[PDB]
């Protein structure tokens, strides 16, 4: 072990010789030059690629622990409805007749109203922990590590992120739970020898476990009493508060309404019947004693909202955070499948940074407004967490590079993509943070991005198709491909997404540093700053390609091959 000296502040690039810039004659009017370059860029006919293929879950498994999946009739129905479903035999003598588990599973599988099939094709690992006996209205559960161990055995070792749904939890908020950070790891569920907190730490830290929990409904509700407001997540949903290293593999799920409803009856079962409120708001909590749990001011960092409705049968539908959690579990499993190189934490960030905003005017409904509904905020809130889940947007990859956590720092997104894999990030990505591309595979940024922390290409390929607001650095083993509409250096605030291109906002100090490979296509790509090529670097122009550098072109020495 030998100490290192810190590097003296110097910027050697200040001494790099410059290369003649063809645009130099036009630089007397920088505004006009920006305008012309941008016009040419916008009129380019280059196409923007998209990933069109989806496996729809078919290549992965997903866990669920709920009331009961052991009834032989039910099993046969579920086996037919969801090909490849696996059932875990009970680990103890508990029994349950509650259909809560099945109702949660239906949502998780994206089941059609007619119950013929699910749109999601992942293989559920369905475990039974209900203990309410012969009473079917009794939803009580008895979780244990023994069951979890059996669930995790069914996951393929090669499945990097392993999503598990938990639509159950304590009738107590995390902050009110009678435990401390010093004693939380002393508690064992009945029958276990391993404390649950310790178990969950192992799963999250070593096994890519991603645990999705219903945030909670009401406090102290009974069959006849709607109980009180629950103003923070339940104990298990909020466990990272007491065990910080769980956060990276934890999501609490607040139940909300896609569209504001009004109560219009109760089925013989006790099940609600509601109507769409005329001109109702979008993505909003319920009113009065119908209102479900808030995330609260701590857990909001690992919280997200989703639709709180079960799959309707004959116009009646159960309501609860129990039905919101499985939607998040499903979206997480699908995102993990598509971006199978992501860590569990990167999947959480993907979901959190692609949500829709909450309590929106009814006029924002409809497909034409899908992007207008996007939440663009750099922090979560105590009611909704990171906002309303959007599975479709999540599947196009992260929507912000920034810290999304209470206890960590996810400012830098470390995209490690292996050889033979290509991924497309197709959303507009905002945020204070930035991107580090590693592994031998390829990442495309296909949209107008406003994140401020820059991109570093350490290995494999990064491809830029449109605006990249902040600086870009290609290191020695990295490769950057610039497409005709690429623009590096654009003055957008880190907390906004780009919604109009204004040429006046093209910068003159945002630099592209190349110590590896830069490949240029078209004649219209722009660097709003300097192009700096270092010893050992390659600059390749495909078929007469040109790069428009608004700053200076610099080379480390005469050995560098650029133009």
Q: In what order do the strands lie in the sheet with 472-474?
A: 18-19, 553-555, 531-533, 512-514, 472-474, 455-457, 434-438, 412-416
CB 257 within 8 A of CB 286: yes
Largest CA distance in the chain: 86
Collapsing DSSP states into helix, strand and coil, what is residue 432? coil
Closest Cα to residue 226, out of 286, 173, 166?
Answer: 286
Q: Would you list the domain boundaries of the chain?
A: 12-52+395-555, 61-252+284-307+319-350
Q: Work out the burial of residue 377: count CB atoms within 10 Å of its CB; fewer than 13 is exposed, 13-18 middle, 19 or more buried.
A: middle
8-state DSSP, 224: S
CA atoms within 13 A on the CB side of 30: 11
Residue partners of 156: CB distance under 8 A and separation at least 6: 61
Resolution in Å, one decimal, please: 2.0
Closest Cα to residue 110, out of 259, 242, 249, 307?
Answer: 307
Q: Is the dihedral of CA 285, 287, 288, 289 positive or negative?
A: negative
Cα 191 versus chain centre, distance: 35
Residue partners of 475: CB distance under 8 A and separation at least 6: 456, 457, 458, 459, 515, 516
DSSP letter string over 142-210? ---HHHHHHHHHTS-TT-S-EEEEE----SSBTTTSS--TTTGGG---TT-SS-HHHHHHHHHHHS-EE
Residue partners of 432: CB distance under 8 A and separation at least 6: 378, 402, 403, 411, 451, 452, 453, 494, 495
Closest Cα to residue 410, out of 398, 401, 419?
Answer: 401
From residue 118, alpha-carbon distances to 84, 85, 123, 130, 221 in Å are: 12, 12, 11, 24, 32
CB 193 within 8 A of CB 203: no
Tokens of 82: 């969801």
CATH superfamily, domain 61-252+284-307+319-350, is Peptidase S8/S53 domain (3.40.50.200)
Closest Cα to residue 218, out of 154, 158, 276, 169?
Answer: 169
CA distance 386 to 404: 9
Identify the H or E element spanning 512.
Answer: strand 512-514
Tokens of 309: 């409705």
Identify the H or E element spanning 117.
Answer: none
8-state DSSP, 355: P
Tokens of 280: 């109702």
CA distance 128 to 150: 11
């Amino acid at each position: 072990s030998i100490p290192s000296t810190p590097s003296t502040p110097s910027v050697p690039e200040d001494n790099f010789p410059t290369v003649a810039n063809p645009l130099d004659s036009q630089k007397g009017n920088i505004s006009a030059l920006k305008e012309k370059l941008n016009r040419n860029r916008e009129n380019s006919t280059a196409t923007i690629p998209t990933e069109t293929i989806s496996y729809n879950g078919s290549t992965v498994k997903i866990g669920i622990l709920d009331s009961d999946f052991t009834d032989p009739v039910r099993k046969a129905q579920l086996s037919a409805r969801y090909p490849g479903i696996e059932f875990i035999p009970r680990v103890n003598s508990d029994t349950s007749t509650s259909s809560h588990g099945v109702q949660v599973l239906e949502v998780m599988m994206d089941t059609l109203e007619d119950r013929t099939k699910g749109k999601a094709k992942f293989k559920a690992i369905a475990a039974s922990i209900g203990n309410g006996g012969a009473s079917e209205t009794n939803k009580s559960v008895n979780p244990n590590v023994k069951t979890y161990e059996k669930v995790f055995e069914r996951f393929n070792f090669n499945q990097k992120v392993k999503v598990v749904n938990q639509s159950f939890g304590a009738d107590i908020t995390i902050e009110e739970a009678p435990y401390t950070k010093n004693n939380i790891r002393n508690y064992v569920w009945a029958g276990d020898s391993k404390p649950f907190a310790t178990y969950f730490e192992e799963k999250v830290n070593n096994d890519g476990g991603l645990f999705v929990w219903a945030a909670g409904n009401r406090k102290g509700a009974t069959e006849t009493n709607p109980g009180q407001d629950m103003d923070s997540v339940g104990m298990e949903a909020g466990l990272p508060y007491l065990v910080n290293d769980l956060e990276k593999g934890w999501i609490a799920v607040v139940g909300i309404q896609p569209k504001e409803t009004v109560r219009v009856g109760t089925a013989p079962d006790g099940t609600p019947i509601v109507n769409i409120k005329p001109n109702g708001k979008l993505n909003i909590h319920r009113t009065g004693t119908d209102r479900l749990a808030y995330a609260g001011d701590n857990a909001k960092y690992w919280s997200i909202s989703a639709d709180d409705s079960a799959i309707p049968t004959a116009g009646r539908a159960g309501i609860g955070s129990s039905y919101a959690a499985p939607r998040v579990s499903r979206a997480a499993a699908l995102v993990a499948e598509k971006f199978d190189w992501m860590t569990a934490d990167q999947v959480r960030q993907t979901l959190f940074t692609t949500t829709d905003d909450t309590e929106l005017d009814a006029s924002l409904a409809g497909n034409a407004n899908a992007e207008k509904r996007r939440r663009v905020k750099t922090s979560p809130d105590y009611k909704y967490g990171w906002g309303m889940l959007n599975q479709e947007r999540a599947l196009k990859g992260p929507g912000a590079f920034m810290d999304v956590t209470k206890y960590g720092n996810t400012n830098i997104f470390n995209a490690e993509i292996p050889a033979g894999k290509t991924s497309y990030f197709e959303n507009k990505i905002f945020g204070f943070g930035g991107l580090v591309k590693s592994g031998e595979g390829t990442l495309h940024l296909t949209n107008d991005n406003s994140y401020a922390g820059g991109s570093v290409v350490n290995r494999g390929t990064l491809e830029i198709h449109k605006i990249h607001s902040s600086k870009v650095t290609v290191n020695q083993a990295g490769r950057l491909v610039l497409h005709p509409k690429a623009l590096i250096g654009y003055n957008e605030a880190f907390f906004n997404v780009i919604t109009t291109v204004d040429p006046t906002r093209i910068t003159t100090g945002t630099n592209l540093r190349n110590k590896g490979i830069v490949e240029v296509n078209g004649t219209t790509a722009i660097i709003g700053g300097d192009y700096i090529a270092y010893k050992g670097s390659t600059t390749t122009f495909n078929n007469g390609a040109k790069l428009n550098v608004l700053g200076n072109i610099k080379v480390e020495d005469g050995t560098v091959k650029v133009l």
